[PDB]
Amino acid sequence: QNYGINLPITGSMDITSTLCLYYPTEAATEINDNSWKDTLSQLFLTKGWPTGSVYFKEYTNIASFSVDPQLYCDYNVVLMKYDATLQLDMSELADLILNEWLCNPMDITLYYYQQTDEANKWISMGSSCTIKVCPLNTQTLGIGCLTTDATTFEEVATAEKLVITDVVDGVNHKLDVTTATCTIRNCKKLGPRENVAVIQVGGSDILDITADPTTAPQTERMMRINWKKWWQVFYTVVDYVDQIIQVMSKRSRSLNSAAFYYRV
Amino acid sequence: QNYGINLPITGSMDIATSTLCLYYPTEAATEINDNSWKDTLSQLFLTKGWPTGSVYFKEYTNIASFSVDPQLYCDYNVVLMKYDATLQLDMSELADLILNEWLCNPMDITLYYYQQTDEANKWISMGSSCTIKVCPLNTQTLGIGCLTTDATTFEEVATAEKLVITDVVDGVNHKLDVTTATCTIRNCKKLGPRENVAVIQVGGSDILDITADPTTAPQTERMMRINWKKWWQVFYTVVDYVDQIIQVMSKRSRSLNSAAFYYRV
Amino acid sequence: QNYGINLPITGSMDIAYALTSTLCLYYPTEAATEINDNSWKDTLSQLFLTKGWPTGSVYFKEYTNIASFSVDPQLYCDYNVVLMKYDATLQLDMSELADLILNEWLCNPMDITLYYYQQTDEANKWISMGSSCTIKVCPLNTQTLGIGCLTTDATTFEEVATAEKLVITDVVDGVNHKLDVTTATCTIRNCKKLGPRENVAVIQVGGSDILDITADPTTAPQTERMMRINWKKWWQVFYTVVDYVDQIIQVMSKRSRSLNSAAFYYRV
Amino acid sequence: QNYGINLPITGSMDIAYATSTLCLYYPTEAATEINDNSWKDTLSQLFLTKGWPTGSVYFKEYTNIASFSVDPQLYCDYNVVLMKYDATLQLDMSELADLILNEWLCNPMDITLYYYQQTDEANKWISMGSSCTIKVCPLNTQTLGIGCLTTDATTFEEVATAEKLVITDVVDGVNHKLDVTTATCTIRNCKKLGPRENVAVIQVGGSDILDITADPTTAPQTERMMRINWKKWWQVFYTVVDYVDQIIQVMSKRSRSLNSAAFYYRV
Amino acid sequence: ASLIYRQLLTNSYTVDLSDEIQEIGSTKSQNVTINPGPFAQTGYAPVN
Ligand SMILES: [Ca+2]
Ligand SMILES: [Ca+2]
Ligand SMILES: [Ca+2]
Ligand SMILES: [Ca+2]
Ligand SMILES: [Ca+2]
Ligand SMILES: [Ca+2]
Ligand SMILES: [Ca+2]
Ligand SMILES: [Ca+2]
Ligand SMILES: [Ca+2]
Ligand SMILES: [Ca+2]
Ligand SMILES: [Ca+2]
Ligand SMILES: [Ca+2]
């Protein structure tokens, strides 16, 4: 209980959880049974999860879910339906919910903002996020744009529910986001979030959760299954819950000993 | 991992980028009646030694409105709270919520009876209009001074409150009747202090009971108070003495999610 | 000679030890239609002879569709190479076919009108094949009463397949189920995955690599025998297969089950 | 790799040492006489007493020996086939018993192009189908027929006519041309490998008439070939259930094959 | 004195008999299965 300090841990070589399951409304529509949640709860009970420990969350679309996706649970499994036209949206959602972000406010009408390093990004969430950026040189004049006129700005998003923006580091920008229907925050990626796993249904493993173009890492918590029946999807998840949990882990920020290290 | 929390640290008794959020009521901005005052304050903070782009200004209309799920954004948070004689309890509740670390679990009043385990266990309810009525139950799960079926006989402990910290007798089950449509109630435990936030009260006397115990009324270093007649003077005071305020505060308590409470399902 | 037992095999790590088979190539009718040459099988046979395969050792099998081929894909041949055409809407069908023809399955019968069924292990599935499979399952609690379904009424059953030529159902292990398969056209068996089938390799001619032959959602292994190519000409596809037959055979191996040392180990 | 089949096993002569599936093939006559809807459920319950858990005993129904001989399938670890004796079907019973009880390795036999010869006494020609009509013309060393013109099939010597299952044995070492009716028949060149302990045959009625060897000087009566006198199919089924222990003890499930086919196919 | 713990653990099969004594006096009730599902929306026919 010496919180807040990092002390070396020496080891010798010679020697009650809650699960949340997020699914699209299409799944419930196809199931077309109102007792399906209770059925899955009883199946999870057979797998060992006591009744009431499994929560079922429904979202209408990846677009809607991407608006501040709060996941309160010891373990979270998100069933993401693949659409070939939503590759970037799926990637951004996965990046936001599979990593821990420390976000600070942004007041675009009062300050110019730059990204300090590779771990820094601008995360914008809202009804309609339209982000236009004007880079400034060392004299505080636009490069390819005019600070006074926002039409000349360079548009990097349009009516986006969720957008992760990555401008060139070390250069100040003037932003012109739609603060009325969007909130933009200057975030830094601390690391992975072991609490959450994504199971894509359909598609061909198209997810880039790294802004680096030279890497498209496929973590153990990113899974993909071919599907035709949502009942079979849910049966697979229930039957292999043990493997999914083993792939995931408790949230380090949640655990005690995270006090004074950006807890929760 | 453990970060070695279970390990001792030995020290010798002889050896020898952050952000600042300022919460203010709309009254202050109205009285100042200047459009560039935020830029002016940013420049004055720069003179103090705060890099441009590190100070942010958050505005709330009222203490009651701000009490609805307050958000703590920066590494240092400083809330200017205006004193009203009729809002002593509201100021105390808001100060308790934003100065102490809370761990809250969901409550489903419509399907369960609830009790407070220990003195640290309170019921924090927030929303547009919270109206909590309670019925204590005896050992046989029967109402005491109330009919469990009939809610009109329940005892009213809050009325159209934006924020309530209800404290009932420990070890006694209660049936709760609240307006869940315009209010959410959570079973919270006070973990401890939150050195990330400080409250400067502009106005009246030293009135902030951040402890439910009636025999204790602590006044921590983060609970400051000033006498005011001009909001420009108030802000000049804050800017000039930011170093003292920061020294009183500690940025390590900053949370990841900016919510006033840690939520557990 | 000592069949049926498992005697340890001992070998040395510091010793130097300084055609007859048969190949079957399965392709869709689209390939033949595009090639539009009567003697194309003979031409490929001659080219295989150039590569070292005696004439008469290369068989050319034609299937109309993936869906039709999935109905009992009998491959009796020392080496089998299945060129399956990718379709965006048939990912699960392709995965099921690949699993069925790439793994060894020990299957027992299922009389769903006499018995409830439970899968006892991660390697136990229900494989159903036929003209039209429509599997509808009802899980039962410990009282043999349906969970979320009515044991007496099938319309309340939960459907996990609809007019499927081939399907591999995986239900929650350890719980009894009452099934309502359409046995009038489709037959269902309780199968256990012994392991990989070295005889068969599948070349996906088309889109990206989407096959996963493991029910476990956490793993999608891409073994040696699962190959993938891009294409615009079936002649080019066949030329590639002929030219790199040696690599394909090296990736594959003779079927372990049919080896005369597997006697009393589920074959010969 | 090879399970160490080439290595030896040394056992001592003194040291004290001290879910299988069961298929029951029966004719439709049995079901008709039983005349009960749930007799399979009853027999399942009774097997449960002998120790076979529910879901392990399966009942297969075949209309006739003739039909069942058309590519028979062996589904369970222990396959018990009840064969109804008919004095006019002795050879059919013998052929079916040989096919199921003995393991066979068969190769394809394209007859429209190639002459074929039997190699050793272990090689036969097994033909199955709706109607297998086989006419063989032996050839001398010059590839000319012996007692039959090669071109004209009417001179060929018939060996089977409209048969569901035929196990043809011709003189070894002499080529033959076969005019087999391939439209409704498939003929394969097979070799008998050895016994199949997976399957046992129980003959109801009759007088112990089954030769499972092509050799005329030998009609072995293995332990898996059994016979019982019968007058009620309920009595027959109760006998089988009550004595399943003895039948299983006489059988062995290590011969369970990966596929249900009665023969191993090699191209 | 440990005999109290040992005997309390040993003679625990009588708890079942006490439970049966309570059960026989308990009042019993039964519940019927609840018709579930997204019930089809059927309204009035078109009339004049
Ligand atoms: Ca521009
Ligand atoms: Ca987006
Ligand atoms: Ca950047
Ligand atoms: Ca209040
Ligand atoms: Ca009252
Ligand atoms: Ca209390
Ligand atoms: Ca399929
Ligand atoms: Ca149902
Ligand atoms: Ca399963
Ligand atoms: Ca003649
Ligand atoms: Ca015959
Ligand atoms: Ca012969």
Which positions in chain A have a beta carbon within 8 angstroms of at least one beta carbon in chain E?
A: 32-35
Cβ-contact D96, D212 below 8 angstroms? no
Touching chains, C (3+ CB pairs < 8 A): A, D
Q: What is the C-alpha to C-alpha distance for residues D254 and D265, in angstroms, rounded to an integer?
A: 19
Q: What is the C-alpha to C-alpha distance for residues C198 and B175, in angstroms, rounded to an integer?
A: 66
D163: tokens are: 């048969």
The residues facing D26 across adjacent strands are D61
Cβ-contact A185, A108 below 8 angstroms? no
Task: Tell me the torsion sign for CA atoms D117, D123, D127, D133.
Answer: positive
**Which residue numbers of B belong to the known binding site?**
34, 90, 93, 116, 145, 153, 155, 161, 163, 167-168, 170, 240
Task: Select from A107, A112, A261 the residue whose CB has the most chain B CBs within 10 Å, as the one to mutate to test that interface.
Answer: A107
Cβ-contact C86, C32 below 8 angstroms? no
Task: Select from B5, B23, B45, B191 the residue whose CB has the most chain A CBs within 10 Å, as the one to mutate to test that interface.
Answer: B5
Burial environment of residue B11 by CB neighbours within 10 A (0 to 12, 13 to 18, 19 or more): exposed
Nearest to C139 among A33, A43, A223 (CB): A43
Cβ-contact B181, B125 below 8 angstroms? no
Q: What is the C-alpha to C-alpha distance for residues B67 and D256, in angstroms, rounded to an integer?
A: 74
B224: tokens are: 């400051």
Q: Which of C188, C27, C199 has its CA nearest to residue C104?
A: C199
Neighbouring C-beta atoms of residue B7, cutoff 10 Å: 14
Which residues are CB-contacts of B19 (< 8 A; sequence separation ≥ 6)? A104, A105, B54, B55, B56, B73, B74, B75, B76
Instruction: Give the up-direction half-sphere exposure of residue A215: CA atoms within 13 A in the CB hemisphere.
Output: 7
Longest dimension (CA), chain B: 69
Q: Which of C19, C74, C25, C21 has its CA nearest to residue C201?
A: C25
Q: What is the C-alpha to C-alpha distance for residues B187 and B56, in angstroms, rounded to an integer?
A: 32
If you compute the radius of gyration of chain B from its CA atoms, what whole number of angstroms results? 21
Cβ-contact D186, D244 below 8 angstroms? no
Cβ-contact A71, A55 below 8 angstroms? no
Neighbouring C-beta atoms of residue D96, cutoff 10 Å: 25
Output the CA torsion D151→D157→D161→D163 (10° steps).
Answer: -100
Residues of A in contact with B53 (CB under 8 A): 111-113
Nearest to B5 among A3, A113, A253 (CB): A3
In sequence order, what E strands does chain A have? 19-24, 54-59, 75-81, 99-105, 120-129, 132-135, 154-155, 160-165, 173-175, 182-192, 196-201, 222-225
Task: Select from D39, D71, D258, D265 the residue whose CB has the most chain C CBs within 10 Å, as the one to mutate to test that interface.
Answer: D258
Output the CA torsion C164→C170→C175→C181 (10° steps).
Answer: 10
Neighbouring C-beta atoms of residue C237, cutoff 10 Å: 21
Instruction: Give me the residue label for tokens 């407070």.
Output: B116
Burial environment of residue B59 by CB neighbours within 10 A (0 to 12, 13 to 18, 19 or more): middle
Cβ-contact C252, C201 below 8 angstroms? yes
Neighbouring C-beta atoms of residue D7, cutoff 10 Å: 14
DSSP string, B63-96: HHHHTSS-B--SSEEEEEEE--GGGHHHHHHHHH
Task: Report the SS3 class of residue B2.
Answer: coil
Q: What is the C-alpha to C-alpha distance for residues C173 and D36, in angstroms, rounded to an integer?
A: 34
Q: How close is the Cα of D88 to the center of ligand 10, in Å?
A: 27
Q: What is the C-alpha to C-alpha distance for residues C146 and D181, in angstroms, rounded to an integer?
A: 53
| CB-based contact D54 C115, cutoff 8 Å | yes
Nearest to A263 among B39, B258, B262 (CB): B262
Burial environment of residue A84 by CB neighbours within 10 A (0 to 12, 13 to 18, 19 or more): exposed
- Asked if A113 reaches chain B (Cβ–Cβ under 8 Å), the answer is yes
Q: How close is the Cα of C122 to the center of ligand 9, in Å?
A: 6
Q: What is the C-alpha to C-alpha distance for residues A106 and A126, in angstroms, rounded to an integer?
A: 14
| CB-based contact A2 B7, cutoff 8 Å | yes
DSSP string, A211-251: S-TT-----TTEEEE--S-HHHHHHHHHHTHHHHHHHS---
Q: What is the C-alpha to C-alpha distance for residues B170 and B92, in angstroms, rounded to an integer?
A: 22
Nearest to A244 among C162, C212, C218 (CB): C218
Task: Report the SS3 class of residue A42.
Answer: helix
Q: What is the C-alpha to C-alpha distance for residues A183 and A193, in angstroms, rounded to an integer?
A: 22
Q: What is the C-alpha to C-alpha distance for residues A121 and A117, in angstroms, rounded to an integer?
A: 9
Helical segments of D81-222, H only: 90-101
Q: Which of B11, B29, B1, B23 has its CA nearest to residue B231?
A: B29
Q: What is the C-alpha to C-alpha distance for residues A44 and A18, in angstroms, rounded to an integer?
A: 12
Tell how many helices (H) and how many strands (E) occur in chain D: 6, 11
Q: Which amino acid is at D35?
A: N
Q: How close is the Cα of B92 to the center of ligand 4, in Å?
A: 8
One-letter-per-residue 3-state SS of E1-48: CCHHHHHHHHCCCHHHHHHHHHHHHCCCCCCCCCCCCCCCCCCCCCCC
Backbone angles phi, psi at A158, to 5 degrees: -155, 115
Q: Which amino acid is at A112?
A: Y
Buried b (16+ CB within 10 A) or exposed e, B204-230: eeebbbbebeeeeeeebebbbbeebee
Measure the CA angle with vertex D255, ends D250 and D260; round to 5°: 115
Instruction: Give the up-direction half-sphere exposure of residue E30: CA atoms within 13 A in the CB hemisphere.
Output: 2
Q: Closest-lying ligand to the alpha carbon of B114?
A: 6
- Asked if C109 reaches chain D (Cβ–Cβ under 8 Å), the answer is yes
Backbone angles phi, psi at C187, to 5 degrees: -115, 135
Residues of E in contact with A34 (CB under 8 A): 36-38
Touching chains, E (3+ CB pairs < 8 A): A
One-letter-per-residue 3-state SS of chain C: CCCCCCCCCCCCCCCCCCCCCCEEEEEEHHHHHHHCCCCHHHHHHHHHHHHCCCCCCEEEEEECCHHHHCCCCCCCCCEEEEEEECCHHHHHHHHHHHHHHHEEEEEEECCCCCCCECCCCCCEEEEEEEEEECCEEEEECCCCCECCCCCCCHHHCEECCCCEEEEEECCCCCCCEEECCCCCCEEEEEEEEEEECCCEEEEEECCCCCCCCCCCCCCCCCCCCEEEECCCCHHHHHHHHHHCHHHHHHHCCCCCCCCCCCCCCCCC
Question: Checking phi first, is residue C249 left (phi over 0); if not, alpha (psi -120 to 50) or beta?
Answer: alpha
Touching chains, D (3+ CB pairs < 8 A): C
Q: In what order do the strands lie in the sheet containing D199-204?
A: D57-62, D22-27, D78-84, D199-204, D225-228
Q: How close is the Cα of C22 to the center of ligand 7, in Å?
A: 29
Q: Which of A132, A133, A117, A124 has its CA nearest to residue A188?
A: A117
Buried b (16+ CB within 10 A) or exposed e, C146-166: bbbbbeeeeebbbbbbeebbb
Neighbouring C-beta atoms of residue D68, cutoff 10 Å: 22
A18: tokens are: 């809650």
Instruction: Give me the residue label for tokens 């004193």.
Output: B83
